[PDB]
């Protein structure tokens with residue numbers, strides 16, 4: 376039983392714009408999601424200052440990137456604060472689009488507070504799987520269209536705490552499934568992240 380919701384008008388506009396743009400430096404999406412992951416980790420860590428038990432659901436603070444080639448999927452996981460069903464369901468958007476019209480580089484998206492949407496530069500569908508200490512695990516899904524769904528999660532691996540951004544990459548952006556490519560993008564735009572960034576690589580035994 377999934378629930379469907381309509382996106383705020385400006386958001387639907389932003390997604391269409393991003394998923395269709397021919398912008399050339401699409402790799403910036405990884406910088407933005409890692410940044411958001413880092414932000415969520417900061418949150419749970421700061422919250423744990425006066426409520427240590429909050430960390431018990433998942434003691435390790437990390438950002439993990441897992442390419443799943445067979446499915447043409449790239450996952451960006453963090454053991455941050457997570458999001459409840461209400462948070463997933465419920466700006467900076469309009470001002471950013473106006474900046475874009477004037478010539479601003481798409482890479483400024485994060486400074487406008489909407490960097491999450493840069494994922495549509497390399498993917499045409501996304502599932503945000505999240506588990507907040509305050510709610511059950513839920514799945515938020517969008518295909519850049521005007522509506523998104525939120526479903527109680529009974530199909531994905533249990534997240535102790537945190538969020539998984541599961542990107543369904545576009546057929547021409549499959550390079551982001553490659554370990555070599557992924558590393559260089561990370562090393563290039565995320566040198567000062569306080570959390571370990573783990574890359575999960577699958578290698579056939581010799």
Ligand SMILES: CC(C)NCCCn1c(Sc2cc3c(cc2Br)OCO3)nc2c(N)ncnc21
Pocket residue numbers: 411412415453455456457458463488489490491492503515537538
């Ligand atoms: C204070 C509040 C306005 N910040 C919201 C940040 C939402 N968010 C984001 S950005 C985001 C996430 C969404 C979303 C919109 C955004 Br923007 O709808 C689908 O889930 N990434 C997060 C993450 N990795 N962990 C926890 N929260 C995350």
